[PDB]
């Protein structure tokens, strides 16, 4: 069995192996690259997503999102403030600004240390989820948005035609803001481009050991896990990697720096955060392989978790038992 410890694994593809998208990840995966639940991706020194960002001020983060934290420093979640709209500009300068830069450090290590002891005394101010992209038209490799799309996946595979389409959501960060502990809508794959600034520290669960994870959120989070039998679906758990350790859960970390590519596995669950202004670029695709990943997803039906158009027919389609209970919860 290949990476029976379930290591991070880092790969480095030429530009040759760079043209196949499906062909690498079934590669990474030959190498064991999923047990991890997530891999690194170097891009051959030849390639680039665009020619530069130097114009990227003028897009509008409507929505943008205070990270306010309830709990302690190793055990916590964050609720969403919706603020007012603001452009990549004015984040980004906000992001500099004295209340909200990254402090003074020494390397990684010291500042995910600043990270854990500190973040629940701060709301830093995230955009996500904004649908675009940011690579050029001409970039014919590893471009997230000209990717095989699910629904073509599943069609392939299964022989279904469905409705819905696939496209890439941009974040803007800035120090401290934070990702919580999931895994993806359905249990997919991610992948996700670091475009500019500052990195991304990044924990992950092996897939073949999420249930554990699950277990412990149960118990650190009860009156959570009571209103929801996947309340992890509602993205605002926090669990320190101290706080797993002294649990037993098995878990790794990797930092993404700008200009390298993270893929999330099915069922791999992960959590992390921001080390100061940045963009990244991620999307949802699917493989074979995530087929019986999808069949087997756990579901939010408590009205908390609302997702995406599109999840309506991998539900329908994969999980018709549930697929009533479900859409009462979307509705
Ligand atoms: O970058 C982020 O804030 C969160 N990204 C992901 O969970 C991902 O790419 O799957
Ligand atoms: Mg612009
Ligand atoms: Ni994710
Ligand atoms: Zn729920």
């Known amino acids: 069995a290949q990476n029976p410890n379930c290591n991070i694994m880092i790969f480095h593809p030429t530009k040759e192996e760079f043209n196949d998208f499906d062909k690498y990840i079934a590669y990474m995966e030959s190498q064991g690259a999923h047990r991890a639940g997530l891999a690194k991706i170097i891009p051959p020194k030849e390639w680039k997503a665009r020619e530069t960002y130097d114009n990227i001020s003028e897009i509008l983060i409507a929505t943008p999102l205070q990270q306010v934290a309830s709990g302690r420093a190793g055990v916590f979640t964050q609720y969403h403030k919706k603020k007012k709209a603001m452009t990549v500009g004015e984040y980004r300068h906000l992001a500099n600004s004295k209340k909200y830069q990254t402090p003074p450090h020494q390397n990684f290590e010291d500042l995910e240390r600043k990270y854990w002891k500190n973040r629940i005394y701060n709301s830093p101010i995230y955009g996500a989820d904004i649908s675009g992209s940011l690579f050029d038209e001409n970039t014919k490799q590893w471009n997230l948005g000209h990717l095989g799309t699910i629904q073509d996946l599943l069609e392939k595979e299964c022989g279904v035609v469905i409705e819905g389409v696939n496209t890439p959501y941009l974040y803007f960060g800035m120090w401290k803001t934070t990702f919580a502990w999931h895994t993806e809508d ?88 921001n080390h100061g202004f940045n963009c990244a670029e991620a999307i949802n695709f699917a493989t074979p392989r995530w087929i019986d990943y999808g069949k087997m997803a756990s579901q939010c039906s408590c009205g908390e978790a609302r997702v995406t158009f599109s999840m309506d027919a991998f539900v329908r389609i994969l999980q018709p038992e549930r697929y009533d209970l479900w859409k009462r919860g979307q509705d």
């Not at 600034?197 to 050991?209: L, M, N």
């Not at 009571?226 to 679906?233: E, K, P």
């Not at 098995?250 to 999330?264: H, K, S």
């Open 186 to 273: 359905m249990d997919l794959y991610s992948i996700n481009y670091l475009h500019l600034g500052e990195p991304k520290t990044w924990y992950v669960v092996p897939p073949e050991h999420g249930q554990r994870l699950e277990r412990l959120a149960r118990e650190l989070f009860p009156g959570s896990s009571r209103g929801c039998g996947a309340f992890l679906r509602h993205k605002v758990a926090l669990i320190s990697p101290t706080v797993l350790k002294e649990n037993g859960i098995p878990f790794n970390r990797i930092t993404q720096e700008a200009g390298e590519f993270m893929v999330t596995f099915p069922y791999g669950y992960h959590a992390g955060f």
